[PDB]
């Protein structure tokens, strides 16, 4: 932070008659903070001189503090960690031929609010909450009897919405109120987070920032390869635990295609027959049973993703690797 020309860095080949090289001109701020204070991955931090009255309405977090100098923060030797609020996302899409736009029809959210990495996670943990939001893929109305049949067949809550926009508004509000620490899913990183972020952009969702932990009222100007940096910056605060990314693939060499069903079979020795859900089909606008089966497939995909995430020990292995390398946990998970 400098009063003027804060965005201008010193080139290494700066002309001078007393020196002929400069190191560290283009240092990243996180790298400087981590190097100087000897921070090694996620750990407890002792913070002195925290200002509890400086920050107003800047995050989705419960406590907001600040410090005037980085030397006030020192890492501690405590090995234990708090329980992590994990949230599993399963995204069902619809391919629009007109504009060639990928549209979201439903989300299933599975909540695990006491996931402790200090102790082994048990097999087939059940979520503390399970909810599914849906919108009609074709019309503005659903087939009749959907609510009662969903109550009678589907586990967890099911919420019906007239259109996509209110559906993502409810998704964002639920994300804010849940406040999860880790977002769990399959191929989220380069497919479904993209789809989700750009659908929040297209429908002008005002609370879109809740997918991370920072409060922004407007999108970056250049939103519209930089897309990856923008989404990763927006999601900051909630670790993305993707079981089919490079990190998840490196922990499951025994798969071949890393499809959700294949991962389920390989890691948990259980069989799930995948249904090829195509919401372009006209039957999903008047056949309630087909819609209920599709929602059930979304829900089971969500819990399968969560269970495979817990079984392959993705969080603990990535954490340990981060403490060993000294980088950020998110970089280990998604890099």
């Amino acid at each position: 932070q400098t009063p003027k020309s804060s965005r201008d860095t010193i080139p290494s080949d700066l002309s001078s008659d007393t020196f002929y090289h400069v190191f560290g001109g283009n240092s990243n701020i996180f790298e400087s903070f981590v190097i100087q204070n000897r921070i090694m991955g996620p750990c407890w931090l002792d913070i002195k001189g925290a200002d509890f009255n400086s920050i107003r309405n800047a995050s989705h977090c419960a406590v907001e503090v600040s410090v005037d100098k980085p030397q006030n923060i020192t890492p501690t030797t405590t090995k234990t960690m708090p329980n992590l609020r994990c949230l599993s996302l399963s995204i069902q899409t619809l391919m629009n031929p007109k504009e060639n736009k990928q549209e979201i029809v439903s989300i299933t959210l599975s909540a695990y609010r006491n996931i402790s990495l200090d102790s082994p996670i048990p097999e087939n943990i059940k979520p503390d909450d399970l909810c599914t939001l849906v919108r009609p893929p074709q019309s503005t109305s659903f087939p009749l009897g959907l609510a009662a049949l969903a109550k009678q067949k589907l586990p967890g809550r099911v919420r019906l919405f007239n259109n996509e926009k209110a559906m993502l508004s409810c998704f964002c509000a639920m994300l804010k109120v849940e406040d999860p620490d880790v977002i769990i899913g399959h191929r989220l990183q380069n497919v479904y987070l993209d789809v989700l972020a750009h659908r929040m952009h297209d429908l002008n969702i005002p609370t879109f920032s809740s997918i991370g932990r920072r409060l922004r009222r407007t999108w970056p100007e250049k939103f519209g390869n930089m897309n990856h940096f923008f989404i990763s910056d927006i999601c900051s605060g909630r670790l993305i635990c993707d079981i089919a990314n490079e990190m998840g693939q490196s922990l499951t060499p025994k798969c071949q295609s890393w499809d959700l069903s294949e991962m389920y079979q390989v890691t948990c020795e259980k069989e799930h027959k995948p249904l090829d859900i195509d919401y372009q089909n006209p039957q999903y606008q008047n056949d309630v049973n087909s819609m209920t089966m599709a929602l059930q497939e979304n829900i089971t995909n969500c819990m399968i993703s969560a269970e495979v995430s817990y079984r392959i020990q993705l969080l603990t292995l990535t954490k340990q690797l981060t403490n060993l390398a000294g980088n950020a946990w998110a970089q280990t998970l998604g890099g």
């Binding site: 990928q102 789809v195 519209g224």
Partner: protein, 433 residues
Amino acid sequence: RTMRQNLQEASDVLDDQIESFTKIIQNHYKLSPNDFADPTIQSQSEIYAVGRIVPDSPTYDKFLNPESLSLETSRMGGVGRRVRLDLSQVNELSFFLGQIVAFKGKNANGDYFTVNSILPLPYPNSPVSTSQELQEFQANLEGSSLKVIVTCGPYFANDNFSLELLQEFIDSINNEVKPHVLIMFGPFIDITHPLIASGKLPNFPQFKTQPKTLDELFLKLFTPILKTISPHIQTVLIPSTKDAISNHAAYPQASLIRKALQLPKRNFKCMANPSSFQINEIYFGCSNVDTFKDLKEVIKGGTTSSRYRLDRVSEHILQQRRYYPIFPGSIRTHISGADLDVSYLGLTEFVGGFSPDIMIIPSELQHFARVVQNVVVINPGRFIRATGNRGSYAQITVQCPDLEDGKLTLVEGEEPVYLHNVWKRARVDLIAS
């Protein structure tokens, strides 16, 4: 170079085509490489992409349509993956297999790349000359205009071996036309000639000793006749892949050995196929594969369809910066074909990146001479038709260069150079042979 074909080397050449055209597009449109991304994977931001036009199925029908094309990406761009094209949002275009293209588009759902706009590859720069060189050429011509005659095979009909028309043409050029240079394309003794093909070669009473090989047939049938060309007329011999006298049946094709043809050094020059060369200031681009007949377009839009096919094909040749841009090569079903040596497709690119002033691509189609994008494209047609009737040949007359007449355009810069304006200065006549 021998007759070897290596799949890895051919694939390297095919990748390098896309990479070079990517760099050319980025330079021309002042775009950063971060703006270009992989079109085979789903992205919800509009991206720039460069690749090759290929059929969406490796085993494809002979006829393509605007709903059955793909884009093949380079090794770095898309790890060689091929993506189907969604061209419902593009009303006007013209593509062909092997064309390298640039797209601004969006792959939303993973299985289709939607092109929103086309990024036409810029036309190559034209050659330039200094004032001194143009004055030297002015002195060379002694005021008079430059005359160059171009002829193309076959030179004798399908049912005989008469070169009487060729002798008539030689006498005409010797005593009336008197050109400076004469460019003769192959084939000279076409190996697809049905009498040569079937072995129906008769005894020749006008030869003391009968030929024993097609090479000796050339030495006894053509070389006497070609020797009568006046020594003041320098002549250029450019082969075709069907020439029996050539032992290199692949395009690009090495030049003939003049000594083997027993032609005297005084005015006979053998040039490779393709070849690019200067006559005074004039830049010639000569290729002896029928690109005009072979390039088959997929087309949408009334505007482009209302255009002449030949102008579109010539613009395609200019944009692709290579005389035979189609790929895979055309085939004649097995009898003959393009005979592309893919490993050496580098040699068929425009020499130095300059667009030749006059480009000569002989075709089996009707003779034509046209100015496209300030380049004269000449097809002089076949010298003699199949039945033996008169064919055609083209005469090129170019006004002598003059810095004062204004038809040469000065190029701004510290070092003064002048753009040749051949299309302003050349008159092309297609004369019955």
